[PDB]
Design a protein around this nucleic acid. Structure first.
Ligand code: MG
Ligand code: MG
Ligand code: MG
Ligand code: MG
Ligand code: MG
Ligand code: MG
Ligand code: MG
Ligand code: MG
Ligand code: MG
Ligand code: MG
Ligand code: MG
Ligand code: MG
Ligand code: MG
Ligand code: MG
Ligand code: MG
Ligand code: MG
Ligand code: MG
Ligand code: MG
Ligand code: MG
Ligand code: MG
Ligand code: MG
Ligand code: MG
Ligand code: MG
Ligand code: MG
Ligand code: MG
Ligand code: MG
Ligand code: MG
Ligand code: MG
Ligand code: MG
Ligand code: MG
Ligand code: MG
Ligand code: MG
Ligand code: MG
Ligand code: MG
Ligand code: MG
Ligand code: MG
Ligand code: MG
Ligand code: MG
Ligand code: MG
Ligand code: MG
Ligand code: MG
Ligand code: MG
Ligand code: MG
Ligand code: MG
Ligand code: MG
Ligand code: MG
Ligand code: MG
Ligand code: MG
Ligand code: MG
Ligand code: MG
Ligand code: MG
Ligand code: MG
Ligand code: MG
Ligand code: MG
Ligand code: MG
Ligand code: MG
Ligand code: MG
Ligand code: MG
Ligand code: MG
Ligand code: MG
Ligand code: MG
Ligand code: MG
Ligand code: MG
Ligand code: MG
Ligand code: MG
Ligand code: MG
Ligand code: MG
Ligand code: MG
Ligand code: MG
Ligand code: MG
Ligand code: MG
Ligand code: MG
Ligand code: MG
Ligand code: MG
Ligand code: MG
Ligand code: MG
Ligand code: MG
Ligand code: MG
Ligand code: MG
Ligand code: MG
Ligand code: MG
Ligand code: MG
Ligand code: MG
Ligand code: MG
Ligand code: MG
Ligand code: MG
Ligand code: MG
Ligand code: MG
Ligand code: MG
Ligand code: MG
Ligand code: MG
Ligand code: MG
Ligand code: MG
Ligand code: MG
Ligand code: MG
Ligand code: MG
Ligand code: MG
Ligand code: MG
Ligand code: MG
Ligand code: MG
Ligand code: MG
Ligand code: MG
Ligand code: MG
Ligand code: MG
Ligand code: MG
Ligand code: MG
Ligand code: MG
Ligand code: MG
Ligand code: MG
Ligand code: MG
Ligand code: MG
Ligand code: MG
Ligand code: MG
Ligand code: MG
Ligand code: MG
Ligand code: MG
Ligand code: MG
Ligand code: MG
Ligand code: MG
Ligand code: MG
Lengths: 99, 96, 122, 82
RNA sequence: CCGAGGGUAGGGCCCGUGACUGGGGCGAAGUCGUAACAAGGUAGCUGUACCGGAAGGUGCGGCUGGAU
RNA sequence: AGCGCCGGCCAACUCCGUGCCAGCAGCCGCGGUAAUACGGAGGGCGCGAGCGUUACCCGGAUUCACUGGGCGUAAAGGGCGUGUAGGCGGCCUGGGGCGUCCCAUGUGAAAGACCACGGCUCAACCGUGGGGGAGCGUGGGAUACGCUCAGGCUAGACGG
RNA sequence: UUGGAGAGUUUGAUCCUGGCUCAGGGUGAACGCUGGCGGCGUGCCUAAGACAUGCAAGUCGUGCGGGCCGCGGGUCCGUGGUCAGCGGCGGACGGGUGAGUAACGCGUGGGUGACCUACCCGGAAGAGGGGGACAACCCGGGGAAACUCGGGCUAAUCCCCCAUGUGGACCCGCCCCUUGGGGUGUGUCCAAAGGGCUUUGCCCGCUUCCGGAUGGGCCCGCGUCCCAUCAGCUAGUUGGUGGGGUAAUGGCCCACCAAGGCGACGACGGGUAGCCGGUCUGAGAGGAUGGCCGGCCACAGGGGCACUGAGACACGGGCCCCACUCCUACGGGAGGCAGCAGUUAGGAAUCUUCCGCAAUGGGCGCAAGCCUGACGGAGCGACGCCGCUUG
RNA sequence: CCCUCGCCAAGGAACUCUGCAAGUUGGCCCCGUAACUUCGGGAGAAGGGGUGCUCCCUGGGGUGAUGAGCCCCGGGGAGCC
């Protein structure tokens, strides 16, 4: 099937495109423990209906642009700005990891 | 120091001529009709546009155009002419 | 009309790019070298790992010059640069290719090997 | 065309073919589409020939082309019997 | 138009090498002393600072991983 | 029929020669006039159209430790707080079923490896059959625990 | 539950910590001493340095017209061989190598309503009528060769033109679907080549369409080494609109617009490496590895480029630039073994300039058959394993 | 012959105590710019591109009035010698 993923929109600042962050868990292949890893997908939104904070599903799709190979499947939840915080604060810490 | 690969290069040069010549014409005509369709001039646009389409499919008989190119050139040819005549109408022949 | 201080292009593949004339080998006090004349030169610029390197004092035969050379048949020929081919003491090129045309004058002066290796002779 | 033929296994002075369906453009002993039987030319065992007959008929229907010396080992197992 | 590359000019990283120079390892058949190990003959060690041929010394503060 | 070895590790011991020399050496170490440790010899041990050396890989190495180590004095607690991300988190009830677990099914090529048999006089080599797998897709299920959402609590925490 | 041994060495002695060392298995090996036979393997790991000579891709006269020779016998016809040429089909496979690449390259599972597929098979229908070019050959000029210039003529399964329309293509509307999927209506557009025999019948070809099969392109999830003494990176950059391009999606390319995209879950940078099935070891977990065999990729003296084509941006095809070498008659030309052997350099070190198309396989052909350094075998080497001898 | 001045083949500092003298460079706009640093600078570093005229489209300002005219600061396209 077309791969389907669920995540938070962290950017709406492109026209007709959202950045959807998809998260996942898996055991460490040696140390066993369950670990999280995340990844941003540029998802096609022809309708500019998806907002910052939406939790959405995206479905692998024929390529729309370089880097966009997913369209937005549907709304799941709205107003998860707490997730968007988690991401945004993390990027803001990066200014403090340099020299 | 020899080969019939020579033969095969000898031939490619000749097929190259026939091809290029065919493709040249298609663009000359398509653009001609598109030009007409802009200032349309509807009967004439349509008239030349037919001459194009014929030549395109003629090219798709051989190695010149793969069928889908012919399809594609035709599709874009037609779309342009029609939508151009929308800025004044109306279709004097066919078509369609 | 090459004289001490004149920079010449080197038209071979010895690795030398540019040489500065330091002497014209034509008797005790010749003022100028032309086509077919041998100079002694300093290597002022060379590419890495060639037969010859910057600082080397080499010999070279001038093979084309920016001052036109005149001919007994009333004509003259003129090149866009002054160029020389590096040689050894038996007037043989130390390189194995020569780039650009050379002057036919080279032949009558026994730079036979250079004359043949040359893409053109004018 | 896709072909039905003889991939040599076994070893030196010791042939052992796998009658097999593969693309003609493959190398002899290369990845084949499907195995459908074997053939010991030196005949050194009771069944020096085995052929799934039900299968070979499929590929033929669908356009496979057997080699000469495979056509035979298909005759011998009567894949051709009308 | 783009374009292999060529040419001009200025940058970045890396390797090799260099008069001379800084210590380091080692060797051991030397010179000078004897700083540490005993209260090691001024308890030692310490961060820092100044100083001395050299181990080192002294000052300030700290530690006991100090004998009596 | 050769090659290595015979101080210990490590299986195999005596004579001569030498005298901190000549030399051996993987580690520990042998040699300074009675050396099973050097060189030869007799003898012995080990393998055998081979034996031995050098190089490199894994092993022994739980000596990077997931299985399976550690940090007062052996190497090892940050000079001390505050705190971002992260990692982790009390009792009770439900909803969801992401982790997790089970069943089905597709995939998991061939060769190789593993078990059976068989062909080259054996074997090596080679052939025929068998056994599976992790891991990913699909469908169905479970809901203890971890997760998530929702509603309660007071033993943690904070406040009066 | 088929599976797990340890020893020497820090002290006068002890216990502990801790490093060094050894016994084991392995190899594309190499070196020494020694060396009889056979089988299966197996053999340039270094300079992806440079290469003398042969050979590694051609085939069909059942597409065509010609010369040259001969056989047949009354200038010509026939028939045969040969040699080009025009015309197919192959040459994109098969063989080499591992340079580059840390990437959707590979592995694994998926997506294509975004796609192609020669020859092969199944099924639907069809081959009417005209005209033309260029070689070969004749004739002129130019070279030492490579070689070519121009004038003229002639055939065809070569090229073109109209006709025909099962069908197919394209725009617009409509219905089902749901990314560009399937059907329909109007308009427009597109087919063809014949050869041969036993000759009112076959065979091989030719044409357009549908579906199969097979091989591919593109796309996505997850996996894939060392250095953070590399911490910030990005202007076709990230998205958009329109268009160009392709078989097809896509900043793949362009024009315009917006200000975005990425990064401690390690971007960017440097280094190293083709990846897998596997292999080796290890009780296992792990570690190490990718030679031979199979799968994929990449490359073809170093670069760029497209032509031809179903398919190539083509190892033994083309164009251009570079480096190098050679030939010459000194005017001018040629080449690309990382195909098989072979030479040289380098190195501790790695093979016969063998034989054959008999077998398997591939190409062309109705077929006989021709070619095949793929392959089948033979040669050298104790390189490995296995067997056997010196009783 | 001297002064002040213009040009010069090939060369290009070989002149001389010394490039002395004379060349070169040269405004503006844009790109771009190193060591080192007292973080200001070094900097106009260096180096490079542009520069005329014609036509067409177009942005902002001043004065008007909000418009015309006038004046100011531009942008994009196609051309000509
Ligand atoms: Mg787009
Ligand atoms: Mg041919
Ligand atoms: Mg034109
Ligand atoms: Mg076509
Ligand atoms: Mg084409
Ligand atoms: Mg120098
Ligand atoms: Mg450029
Ligand atoms: Mg450049
Ligand atoms: Mg160039
Ligand atoms: Mg020194
Ligand atoms: Mg020194
Ligand atoms: Mg003291
Ligand atoms: Mg003392
Ligand atoms: Mg004291
Ligand atoms: Mg002190
Ligand atoms: Mg003193
Ligand atoms: Mg003092
Ligand atoms: Mg204190
Ligand atoms: Mg031994
Ligand atoms: Mg032993
Ligand atoms: Mg013993
Ligand atoms: Mg002695
Ligand atoms: Mg003795
Ligand atoms: Mg010993
Ligand atoms: Mg002894
Ligand atoms: Mg052990
Ligand atoms: Mg371990
Ligand atoms: Mg080890
Ligand atoms: Mg542990
Ligand atoms: Mg420990
Ligand atoms: Mg300590
Ligand atoms: Mg503390
Ligand atoms: Mg601190
Ligand atoms: Mg927190
Ligand atoms: Mg949590
Ligand atoms: Mg809990
Ligand atoms: Mg719950
Ligand atoms: Mg679940
Ligand atoms: Mg399974
Ligand atoms: Mg298998
Ligand atoms: Mg048996
Ligand atoms: Mg088997
Ligand atoms: Mg198993
Ligand atoms: Mg529950
Ligand atoms: Mg709650
Ligand atoms: Mg409480
Ligand atoms: Mg000791
Ligand atoms: Mg001690
Ligand atoms: Mg002792
Ligand atoms: Mg120990
Ligand atoms: Mg040997
Ligand atoms: Mg020997
Ligand atoms: Mg190699
Ligand atoms: Mg070299
Ligand atoms: Mg060489
Ligand atoms: Mg041959
Ligand atoms: Mg035919
Ligand atoms: Mg013949
Ligand atoms: Mg022929
Ligand atoms: Mg290949
Ligand atoms: Mg091979
Ligand atoms: Mg490689
Ligand atoms: Mg990299
Ligand atoms: Mg990936
Ligand atoms: Mg993938
Ligand atoms: Mg073809
Ligand atoms: Mg005719
Ligand atoms: Mg027609
Ligand atoms: Mg742009
Ligand atoms: Mg588009
Ligand atoms: Mg293509
Ligand atoms: Mg791009
Ligand atoms: Mg990440
Ligand atoms: Mg890191
Ligand atoms: Mg590199
Ligand atoms: Mg490499
Ligand atoms: Mg172990
Ligand atoms: Mg590897
Ligand atoms: Mg290897
Ligand atoms: Mg391989
Ligand atoms: Mg390349
Ligand atoms: Mg190339
Ligand atoms: Mg090469
Ligand atoms: Mg090339
Ligand atoms: Mg080719
Ligand atoms: Mg090529
Ligand atoms: Mg390629
Ligand atoms: Mg190939
Ligand atoms: Mg080749
Ligand atoms: Mg000549
Ligand atoms: Mg030429
Ligand atoms: Mg050759
Ligand atoms: Mg040598
Ligand atoms: Mg060889
Ligand atoms: Mg061989
Ligand atoms: Mg054959
Ligand atoms: Mg055959
Ligand atoms: Mg055939
Ligand atoms: Mg042969
Ligand atoms: Mg002058
Ligand atoms: Mg001048
Ligand atoms: Mg100068
Ligand atoms: Mg100058
Ligand atoms: Mg001077
Ligand atoms: Mg002077
Ligand atoms: Mg001066
Ligand atoms: Mg001055
Ligand atoms: Mg001036
Ligand atoms: Mg001026
Ligand atoms: Mg001035
Ligand atoms: Mg500087
Ligand atoms: Mg300065
Ligand atoms: Mg500064
Ligand atoms: Mg400037
Ligand atoms: Mg300028
Ligand atoms: Mg201009
Ligand atoms: Mg003016
Ligand atoms: Mg003017
Ligand atoms: Mg005023
Ligand atoms: Mg105004």
């Amino acid at each position: 099937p077309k791969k389907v993923l669920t995540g938070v929109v962290v950017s709406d600042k492109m026209q007709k495109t959202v950045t959807v962050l998809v998260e996942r868990q898996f055991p460490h292949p040696l140390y066993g423990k369950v670990i999280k890893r995340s990844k941003k997908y540029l998802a096609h939104d022809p309708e500019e209906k998806y907002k910052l904070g939406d939790v959405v599903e995206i479905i692998e799709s024929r390529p729309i642009s370089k880097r966009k190979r997913f369209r937005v499947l549907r709304l799941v939840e709205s107003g998860r700005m707490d997730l968007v915080e988690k991401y945004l604060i993390r990027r803001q810490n990066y200014e403090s990891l340099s020299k | 120091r020899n080969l019939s690969a020579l033969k095969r290069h000898r031939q490619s040069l000749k097929r190259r001529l026939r091809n290029k010549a065919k493709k040249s014409a298609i663009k000359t005509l398509s653009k001609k009709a598109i030009q007409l369709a802009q200032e349309g001039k509807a009967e004439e646009a349509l008239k030349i546009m037919r001459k194009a389409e014929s030549l395109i499919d003629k090219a798709a008989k051989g190695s010149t155009l793969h069928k889908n190119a012919a399809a594609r050139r035709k599709s874009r040819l037609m779309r342009k002419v029609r939508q151009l005549l929308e800025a004044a109408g109306a279709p004097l022949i066919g078509g369609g | 009309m090459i004289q001490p201080q004149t920079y010449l292009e080197v038209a071979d593949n010895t690795g030398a790019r540019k040489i500065m004339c330091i002497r014209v080998l034509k008797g005790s006090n010749a003022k100028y070298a032309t086509v077919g004349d041998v100079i002694v030169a300093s290597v002022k610029e060379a590419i890495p790992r060639g037969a010859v390197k910057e600082g080397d004092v080499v010999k070279a035969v001038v093979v084309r010059t920016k001052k036109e050379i005149k001919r007994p048949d009333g004509s003259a020929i003129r090149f866009d640069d002054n160029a020389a081919v590096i040689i050894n003491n038996q007037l043989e090129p130390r390189g194995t290719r020569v780039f650009g045309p050379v002057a036919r004058e080279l032949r009558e002066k026994g730079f036979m090997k250079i004359v043949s290796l040359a893409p053109e002779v004018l | 065309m896709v072909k039905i033929r003889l991939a040599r296994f076994g070893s030196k002075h010791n042939p052992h073919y796998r009658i097999v369906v593969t693309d003609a453009r493959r190398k002899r002993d290369g990845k084949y589409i499907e195995k459908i039987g074997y053939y010991d030319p030196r005949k050194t065992t009771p069944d020096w020939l085995k052929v799934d007959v039900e299968r070979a008929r499929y590929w033929l229907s669908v356009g496979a082309q057997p080699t000469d010396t495979a056509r035979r080992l298909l005759r011998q197992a009567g894949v051709f019997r009308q």
